[PDB]
Amino acid sequence: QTAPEVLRQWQALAEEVREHQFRYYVRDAPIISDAEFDELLRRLEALEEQHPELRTPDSPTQLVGGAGFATDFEPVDHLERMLSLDNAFTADELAAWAGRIHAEVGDAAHYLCELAIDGVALSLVYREGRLTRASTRGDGRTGEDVTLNARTIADVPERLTPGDDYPVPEVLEVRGEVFFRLDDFQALNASLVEEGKAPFANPRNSAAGSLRQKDPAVTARRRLRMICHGLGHVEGFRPATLHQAYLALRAWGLPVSEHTTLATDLAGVRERIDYWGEHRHEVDHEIDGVVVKVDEVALQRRLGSTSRAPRWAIAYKYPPE
Ligand SMILES: NC(=O)c1ccc[n+]([C@@H]2O[C@H](COP(=O)(O)O)[C@@H](O)[C@H]2O)c1
Numbered sequence: 001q002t003a004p005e006v007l008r009q010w011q012a013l014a015e016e017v018r019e020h021q022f023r024y025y026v027r028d029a030p031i032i033s034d035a036e037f038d039e040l041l042r043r044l045e046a047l048e049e050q051h052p053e054l055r056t057p058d059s060p061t062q063l064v065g066g067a068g069f070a071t072d073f074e075p076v077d078h079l080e081r082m083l084s085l086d087n088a089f090t091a092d093e094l095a096a097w098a099g100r101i102h103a104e105v106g107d108a109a110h111y112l113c114e115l116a117i118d119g120v121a122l123s124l125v126y127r128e129g130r131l132t133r134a135s136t137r138g139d140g141r142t143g144e145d146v147t148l149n150a151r152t153i154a155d156v157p158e159r160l161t162p163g164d165d166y167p168v169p170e171v172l173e174v175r176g177e178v179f180f181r182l183d184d185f186q187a188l189n190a191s192l193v194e195e196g197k198a199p200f201a202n203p204r205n206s207a208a209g210s211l212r213q214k215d216p217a218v219t220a221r222r223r224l225r226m227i228c229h230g231l232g233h234v235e236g237f238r239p240a241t242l243h244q245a246y247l248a249l250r251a252w253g254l255p256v257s258e259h260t261t262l263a264t265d266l267a268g269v270r271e272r273i274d275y276w277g278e279h280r281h282e283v284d285h286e287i288d289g290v291v292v293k294v295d296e297v298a299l300q301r302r303l304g305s306t307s308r309a310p311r312w313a314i315a316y317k318y319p320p321e
Pocket of ligand 1: 021035
């Protein structure tokens with residue numbers, strides 16, 4: 001029937017051609033010359049001539065030549081429970097979250113502080129260094145499939161950057177947040193009203209809408225941003241602490257925020273919360289809060305996580321004006 005090498009060659013070539021189709025048509029940004037693409041396409045068709053078994057309706061060469069890229073928001077499973085975080089709006093609410101941690105975890109706590117972005121939660125699963133799937137939060141177990149749209153974001157790399165320091169992991173799930181910069185938010189709104197479309201009330205809604213598009217070409221045009229702030233199921237990584245895990249993401253080419261600091265005790269946490277209270281509007285995107293998490297992975301595990309929220313993290317949300 002088909003030889004092992006026959007199938008290997010075909011899948012390899014189909015995948016390469018399929019991907020270039022995505023960049024040229026969907027993202028409108030090809031990474032190879034058109035002439036080269038023509039070479040690849042011919043070879044694919046040649047192979048399909050050679051072997052008619054492989055010719056299928058889903059093949060790049062036959063029945064999806066023009067365009068077969070759509071997003072149907074199919075439910076997809078998250079590798080790890082991705083739960084929403086508990087919120088803390090007062091210093092007093094802080095306090096319980098502060099002491100309780102010290103009761104269970106003890107004195108070797110070391111809380112990580114990160115700015116809280118107000119956009120849409122996005123989960124990426126980056127198997128063998130390739131982006132296999134992007135999905136929304138949903139109910140925490142399963143979410144909608146917006147992989148195609150996630151591939152168009154400038155900030156989201158398709159492939160991980162290999163290096164000796166941080167070897168590319170096997171199966172890697174990295175959570176993050178998609179958002180718009182204030183300037184771009186206004187810009188997109190202007191473009192929208194220019195073409196008769198209704199503008200968005202805020203950047204959160206604007207980003208959510210721009211991501212949730214049935215046709216990913218639409219999302220490719222908008223300047224969505226991304227910042228990775230969490231790790232889901234990871235294989236072959238074993239990052240000791242959360243902050244150390246961030247170096248890994250950095251080495252792999254993933255977007256990370258530059259306003260993350262480590263606070264040894266509650267007092268350090270309070271400073272950051274206070275500081276970002278006066279300076280949070282200086283940032284180019286919407287920051288509604290400060291996120292505090294126990295940095296040590298091993299310690300985190302002990303504290304565990306409740307039915308719908310982690311016990312090792314809490315988000316301080318600044319009061320609305
Ligand atoms: N630069 C790329 O990655 C890439 C990918 C797919 C198609 N293409 C070009 O798209 C064009 C579509 O028009 P034709 O149907 O006349 O080929 C082709 O000429 C092909 O070279 C370019």
